[PDB]
């Protein structure tokens, strides 16, 4: 898996966690 | 007593020296004498060449002719002789240097440049202007072997161009020496001017030579010879190659009685059959003067106060020492194991018609003999290999050609008769080896 996609995924998961 | 010592000294010195005196060869002597007379007295130039078997005193003939021709002084002051030798004077430059030195012109040539050999020889010859040179080249073929044959080319060119008085006396034992010359050199060389030295074919002359060499001459003869040599030693700076350390018979003096007795004995000895047959053998073999002088030197050297009389038995003895075989002696010198190896190789060579052999085969055979031997028991491998090596180093075994030491293929350098004579002569065989070599 790519690093940027992973970073973005975790970022999305965080943005999902904040909600 | 002292007399025997005197005589022995005399004969030794006569044999190993006496560079000038030669017996016979009147025509050749006269021929060379006349040619040198031309070049010296008349001042023209020539190229002579002497062929003859190695051993015959041809250089001695040259020395004799010079010995007779030099002391005339009319010839002495004018001419000078230059000796050159193919073994020593190589590389041409060395020869030219030695020519410069031998002409006594090293100082007059010191510190000067020269474009080529010719331009240097020209200067050397110019310095003489008058005077004349007699070049004497021993081992001519070795000079033919030189690069471009420059020395020969220039010498013969000077001989052909008739410029300056020089004579080129070549000396060799090589018949086809003329074929070794380059066209340019061969053209400038006087063809059919070569003279062959016939040597003493007749046996009576050989025996007579021997008689002359062993016998003692009259006091007057010795005196005259001495005088002539002394006269020779005073010519030039006294640096001729047949003047230095000459026979000098003026150092020996023999009483009439001693002379008569000695010469009588010599004649008596050479009168017999055995001596004559010994000389006959030598003559059959090599018919050269050197061989005779060797035999005679050995014969004379063995004169002692114990046996002051020279006899035919001694001649036959030394003759026997000459006829001997060295390889069979050395073979007898060997050890048992080594000889057993030789026997194995002989078997292998006899059975397989001289097929090359390998250590393993010889070791196999020797082992096959060893396992059933009383003496060669409990001796295996290492020592055998050492013995093999020893045989290889002594060249009793030649190798035909990194390969393995044990697996090297060889040829054997002995004749069955020699090994047989060895067996017969070797002391003391352990009987098993005999039978082992006897059959099967």
């Amino acid at each position: 898996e790519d690093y940027e996609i992973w970073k973005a995924r975790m970022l999305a998961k965080a943005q999902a966690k904040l909600k | 007593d002292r007399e025997l010592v005197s005589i022995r000294r005399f004969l030794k010195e006569r044999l190993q020296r006496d560079y000038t005196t030669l017996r016979g060869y009147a025509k050749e002597r006269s021929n060379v004498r006349l040619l040198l007379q031309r070049t010296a007295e008349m001042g023209e130039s020539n190229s002579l060449l002497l062929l003859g078997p190695r051993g015959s005193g041809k250089t001695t003939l040259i020395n004799s002719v010079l010995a007779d021709l030099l002391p005339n002084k009319s010839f002495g002051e004018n001419t000078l002789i230059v000796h050159l030798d193919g073994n020593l004077h190589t590389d041409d430059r060395v020869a030219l240097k030695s020519i410069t030195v031998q002409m006594q012109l090293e100082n007059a040539a010191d510190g000067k440049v020269f474009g080529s050999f010719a331009e240097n020889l020209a200067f050397l010859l110019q310095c003489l202007k008058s005077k004349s040179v007699i070049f004497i080249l021993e081992e001519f073929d070795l000079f033919c072997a030189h690069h471009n044959q420059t020395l020969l080319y220039n010498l013969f060119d000077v001989s052909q161009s008739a410029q300056a008085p020089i004579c080129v006396l070549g000396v060799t034992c090589r018949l086809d020496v003329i074929e070794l010359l380059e066209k340019r050199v061969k053209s400038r060389f006087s063809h059919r001017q070569v003279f062959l030295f016939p040597s003493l074919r007749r046996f009576e002359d050989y025996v007579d030579l021997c008689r002359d060499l062993l016998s003692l001459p009259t006091g007057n003869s010795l005196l005259l010879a001495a005088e002539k040599i002394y006269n020779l030693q005073n010519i030039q700076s006294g640096a001729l190659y047949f003047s230095r350390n000459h026979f000098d018979p003026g150092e020996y003096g023999f009483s009439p009685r001693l002379r008569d007795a000695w010469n009588k004995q010599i004649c008596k000895v050479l009168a017999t059959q055995q001596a004559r047959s010994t000389l006959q053998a030598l003559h059959d073999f090599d018919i050269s003067e050197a061989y005779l002088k060797n035999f005679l030197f050995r014969l004379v050297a063995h004169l002692r106060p114990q046996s002051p009389h020279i006899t035919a038995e001694k001649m036959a003895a030394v003759g026997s020492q000459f006829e001997g075989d060295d390889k069979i002696e050395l073979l007898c010198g060997l050890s048992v194991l080594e000889l057993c190896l030789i026997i194995a190789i002989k078997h292998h060579s006899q059975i397989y018609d001289r097929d090359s052999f390998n250590f393993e085969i010889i070791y196999a055979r020797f082992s096959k003999f060893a396992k059933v031997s009383t003496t060669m028991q409990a001796v295996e491998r290492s020592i055998v290999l050492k013995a093999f090596e020893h045989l290889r180093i002594a060249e009793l075994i030649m190798p035909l050609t990194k390969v393995q030491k044990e697996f090297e293929m060889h040829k054997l350098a002995l004749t069955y008769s020699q090994i047989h004579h060895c067996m017969q002569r070797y002391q003391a065989l352990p009987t098993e080896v005999a039978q082992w070599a006897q059959s099967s």
Binding site: - | R54, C173, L196, S199, D284, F285, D286, G324, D325, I328
Partner: protein, 310 residues
């Protein structure tokens, strides 16, 4: 010319093997075998000739056989193969050379017809014994034939026949005879006479003996001459020009034993060989290779003959 029976023999053999769809001739060089054989091969008016000298290597024989058989050129192995796979007459000249080296080529070559026609020409008649077919021995010209040839050249009586017989007796070989005849004829021409006398022959003889090599040989010692003769004998027996010391020494022992002379051991013979080698009568290498040193002969038979046997 006087050789006609051999010509007919060869002709008969070849014609026979041609019609019916391995001969072995041998003789000394002075017999002229190749001329006769080629003569018969010319008289018939597949054939391919081979010479042991024209081949740099005996194994290269297969290559030349190839080129002669099927063009153009291939390695000796593939040649051995194509040969292995297989009227075709084949003449071999100077086979002694080829046989002297490796022997495989000749044994093969003689195995090959047993299964075509190959004729092998030799200088010896015992080489197959040193390792089945029809053999032919070329003898030298007889004394009578020699006299006939000499008389034919000069052109039972009388004077011409006398001089002819003399020349034939002295010469021994036909070549030497014809040579002496030539020289005698030259002297006859120079002396402004039509017929050749005896003094002419005597003069030619003296002039032939007066040469440098002959006198040189005449100046040699007895053992040396015996050694030369021994080398010659070795060359005659082997068929090869180069000899090796051993055989020479054997021949020396034979000749010496015949002459009653006791020849010295090998060492002195190596000395002798070296001396003669140095004087350029023969050609020899050092003697470091005793028994195995190669002795070339540099005098020829004619000179030895004029030197020793005249």
């Amino acid at each position: 010319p006087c050789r006609e029976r051999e010509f007919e023999n060869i002709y008969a053999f070849l014609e026979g093997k041609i019609q019916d769809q391995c001969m072995y001739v041998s003789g000394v060089p002075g017999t002229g075998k190749t001329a006769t054989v080629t003569g018969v091969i010319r008289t018939l008016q597949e054939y391919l000739e081979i010479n042991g000298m024209r081949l740099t290597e005996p194994r290269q024989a297969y290559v030349q056989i190839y080129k002669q058989l099927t063009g153009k050129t291939v390695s000796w192995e593939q040649a051995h193969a194509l040969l292995e796979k297989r009227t075709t007459v084949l003449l071999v000249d100077e086979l002694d050379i080829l046989c002297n080296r490796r022997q495989d080529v000749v044994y093969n070559l003689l195995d090959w017809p047993t299964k075509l026609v190959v004729v092998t020409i030799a200088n010896t008649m015992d080489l197959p014994e040193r390792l089945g077919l029809t053999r032919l021995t070329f003898q030298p010209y007889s004394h009578k034939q020699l006299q006939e040839i000499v008389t034919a050249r000069l052109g039972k009586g009388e004077a011409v026949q006398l001089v002819a017989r003399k020349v034939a007796a002295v010469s021994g070989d036909a070549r030497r005879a014809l040579d002496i005849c030539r020289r005698a004829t030259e002297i006859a021409d120079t002396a402004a006479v039509k017929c050749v006398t005896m003094l002419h022959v005597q003069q030619a003889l003296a002039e032939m003996i007066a040469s440098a090599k002959v006198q040189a040989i005449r100046n040699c010692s007895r053992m040396e001459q015996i050694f030369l003769q021994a080398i010659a004998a070795e060359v005659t027996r082997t068929g090869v020009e180069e000899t090796t010391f051993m055989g020479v020494y054997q021949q020396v022992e034979t000749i010496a034993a015949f002459m009653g002379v006791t020849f010295p051991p090998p060492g002195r013979a190596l000395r002798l060989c070296s001396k003669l080698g140095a004087e350029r009568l023969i050609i020899s290498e050092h003697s470091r290779n005793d028994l195995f040193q190669k002795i070339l002969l540099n005098v020829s038979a004619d000179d030895i003959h004029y030197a020793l046997r005249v």
